[PDB]
Each structure stands twice: as C-alpha cells, then as structure tokens.
Amino acid sequence: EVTIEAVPPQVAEDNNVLLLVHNLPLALGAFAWYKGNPVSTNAEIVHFVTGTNKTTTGPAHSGRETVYSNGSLLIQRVTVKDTGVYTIEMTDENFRRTEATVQFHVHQPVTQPSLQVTNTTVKELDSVTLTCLSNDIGANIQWLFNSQSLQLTERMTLSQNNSILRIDPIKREDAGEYQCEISNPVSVKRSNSIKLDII
Numbered sequence: 001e002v003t004i005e006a007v008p009p010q011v012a013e014d015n016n017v018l019l020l021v022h023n024l025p026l027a028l029g030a031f032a033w034y035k036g037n038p039v040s041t042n043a044e045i046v047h048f049v050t051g052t053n054k055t056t057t058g059p060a061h062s063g064r065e066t067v068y069s070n071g072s073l074l075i076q077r078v079t080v081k082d083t084g085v086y087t088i089e090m091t092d093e094n095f096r097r098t099e100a101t102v103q104f105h106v107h108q109p110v111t112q113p114s115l116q117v118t119n120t121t122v123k124e125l126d127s128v129t130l131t132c133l134s135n136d137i138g139a140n141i142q143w144l145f146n147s148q149s150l151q152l153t154e155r156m157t158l159s160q161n162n163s164i165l166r167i168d169p170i171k172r173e174d175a176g177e178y179q180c181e182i183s184n185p186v187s188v189k190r191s192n193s194i195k196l197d198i199i
C-alpha cells in the first residue's frame with residue numbers, strides 16, 4: 001500500500017512541506033492531489049499523466065504546489081490556512097482508483113515574551129505574581145526556576161492559560177530566578193529572568 005508522510009508534519013509559516021509518497025504503484029495511468037477528503041473536483045490541486053509528462057493545475061492551485069512524477073507534492077511558502085488533510089487519487093493501467101491521505105499543521109512562530117513581577121523583594125508568607133507578557137494567542141506557556149522546570153505545588157495558581165503565576169504563601173526556598181517559556185510544535189522562546197529575594 002502507498003503511504004505519505006509530511007516533511008515536516010509541523011511547519012512554520014513561510015516554510016515548505018513535502019508530501020512524500022512511498023510505494024507509488026509503478027503502472028499508474030495518472031494521479032492527482034486534492035485538498036481535503038473525500039475527493040471532489042473543486043478541491044483538485046494538480047493532475048499528472050504518467051506516460052505523457054502532462055500537468056494540469058486544478059481549481060485549488062495557488063501557484064505554490066509542485067508535483068513530481070514519483071507522486072510527491074511540494075507546497076512552498078505555507079500559511080495556517082493550508083493546515084488540514086490532503087488526498088492523492090491514483091488511477092492504474094486499467095481504470096481502477098486508489099486513495100491515500102496525509103495531513104500537516106502549520107503554525108506561526110512564537111514571539112519573544114517578557115516576565116514582569118509584582119515586587120522583587122517580598123516577605124515570607126506574602127504573595128507574588130509573575131506575569132508572562134506575550135501577544136501570542138493560543139501558545140503553550142511553561143514556567144522555569146533556576147533554568148529548570150518549576151515543580152508546581154499547592155501554593156501556586158496558574159491563570160490566563162498559565163501567563164499569570166501567583167505564589168502564595170511564598171517561602172524561603174522560592175528565592176531564585178524565574179523565566180516563562182512560550183512554545184508551539186515549531187518554535188520556542190524564553191523570557192528575561194526575574195531574580196527573587198526572600199526574607
């Protein structure tokens with residue numbers, strides 16, 4: 001059976017993907033790539049005929065998609081709108097058709113976040129709130145302590161998708177350096193550190 005893999009499965013905006021088809025039958029009459037599944041005429045990206053080397057761009061072409069005779073499709077300069085599933089439909093020497101599906105997700109890279117704190121000097125048993133300042137909607141926020149992952153406890157409280165970390169009551173051992181790290185499957189950035197002095 002044929003199998004495709006996205007190269008890469010997760011893709012930055014403006015980068016490329018190869019839809020890499022393994023085990024394309026050798027005796028294909030033609031194949032064609034369609035946006036989404038199941039196969040529809042509107043969705044046709046490209047149609048390639050084996051014997052004649054003839055390409056015809058469908059309604060879904062956007063001037064970025066290149067087909068190779070080995071079945072694989074290169075999409076260059078991707079957008080988040082290109083996310084989703086794609087199908088190759090293959091007609092054999094007779095006129096029998098087979099399908100194969102593949103998907104890939106494309107993300108915008110995360111922007112550089114900042115770390116503000118309510119107060120650097122604070123008294124044991126006070127509260128303190130750290131805020132990860134990012135414009136990035138729907139990004140993954142993780143917290144760090146002296147360059148390693150923060151072990152969360154009963155004393156802590158994450159709000160607004162982890163951008164607000166409040167610690168209460170603070171303790172002798174919370175003294176250290178804090179960063180927030182912001183990520184998606186394609187990119188990651190760390191904030192400035194905030195040093196914290198306890199008394």
Ligand SMILES: *[C@@H]1O[C@H](CO)[C@@H](O[C@@H]2O[C@H](CO)[C@@H](O)[C@H](O)[C@H]2NC(C)=O)[C@H](O)[C@H]1NC(C)=O
Binds near residue numbers: 020021022068074
């Ligand atoms: C099918 O065709 C494509 C393009 O001819 C091949 O992809 C290239 O091969 C290697 C492996 O990914 C890379 O060094 C090239 O840069 C690739 N081209 C790209 C990403 O456009 C692919 O290997 C071929 N082979 C198959 C399907 O077995």
